[PDB]
């Protein structure tokens, strides 16, 4: 119908604007912070995608969990995720954020950040390269591109 066409074009508009202006809050926990900083470094340059360098956590769009989540910092991660306005996304960078990694069997490590927050992109590596992290951010943008918020709203 006509309303189906209008909500299709408006979903395309809002998804274009949300994926083309992603603002990350990076948790610089461990070694993956260095490779996030290389994804911001002038070779890869996240800012040319509209992905700014160090937005404040009250205005960020994605939470990049870059490093080991210990048990002593799991509620801090949860509190920052609760303070993020929607639509918020979470990229899990590297093996300790993904599944505990090299510290999986430790007494003090959350076995993957997915026990604390919902995770949208899992970027594997130890550390994953800055090109691999930029790949994960572009896959997150493609995930935002195919969101159907107003179309499902028009069908509900």
């Amino acid at each position: 119908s006509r309303g189906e066409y209008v909500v299709a074009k408006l979903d395309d508009l809002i998804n274009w604007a949300r994926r083309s202006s992603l603002w990350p809050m990076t948790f610089g926990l461990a070694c993956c912070a260095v490779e996030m900083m290389h994804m911001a470094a002038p070779r890869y340059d996240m800012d040319r995608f509209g992905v700014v360098f160090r937005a404040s956590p009250r205005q960020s769009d994605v939470m990049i969990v870059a490093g080991t989540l210990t048990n002593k910092m799991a509620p801090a991660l949860r509190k920052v995720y609760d303070q993020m306005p929607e639509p918020r996304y979470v990229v899990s960078m590297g093996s300790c954020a993904n599944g505990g990694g090299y510290y999986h069997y430790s007494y003090s490590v959350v076995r993957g950040c997915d026990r604390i927050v919902p995770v949208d992109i899992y970027v594997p590596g130890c550390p994953p390269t800055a090109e691999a992290l930029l790949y994960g951010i572009l896959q997150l943008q493609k995930k935002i591109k195919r969101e159907k918020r107003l179309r499902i709203w028009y069908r509900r």
Binding site: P42, R43, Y44, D45, R48, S92, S95, N98, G99, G100, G101, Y102, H104, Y105, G112, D114, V119, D120, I121, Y122, V123, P124, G125, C126, P128, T129, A130, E131, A132, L134, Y135, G136, L138, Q139, K143
Partner: protein, 176 residues
Amino acid sequence: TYKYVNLREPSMDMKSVTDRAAQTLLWTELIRGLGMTLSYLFREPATINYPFEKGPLSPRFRGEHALRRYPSGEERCIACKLCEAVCPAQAITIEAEPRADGSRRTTRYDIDMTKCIYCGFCQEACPVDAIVEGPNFEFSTETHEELLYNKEKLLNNGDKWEAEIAANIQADYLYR
């Protein structure tokens, strides 16, 4: 065999004192810093055009794991569990048995890619070049269990990437 950083006593004649006062009032070093930033403004940036331009790698690069085969279709892995014995994160889970023609072959070859530390001790422990850590780094997932590889996924990665993996091993096996 050592040197003194910042042990210069500055000259107190009217020439040097007037030089430092002109630097203070007329902001000469601030213009120097502005000039260096302006000099980078007119340089070509170092930014490659990802995804269309890729970062440089080498045949030693340790990316996505793969199980390899012989040049006959037979898989190289003969179930010796050296890779999971050397595995520093215990990402590899192996169960084996003799198959229908009596060969020593695995029935479980799991690699948890979210325990894996990507150090490639498995591919240097491997005596038949069966497990390799191949060249792929662009294999991010939307779900955690899509990074829990079984034997089928690793053999499919080997069949997918063998044309590149074999040439990287051909480039690097003389250093090994």
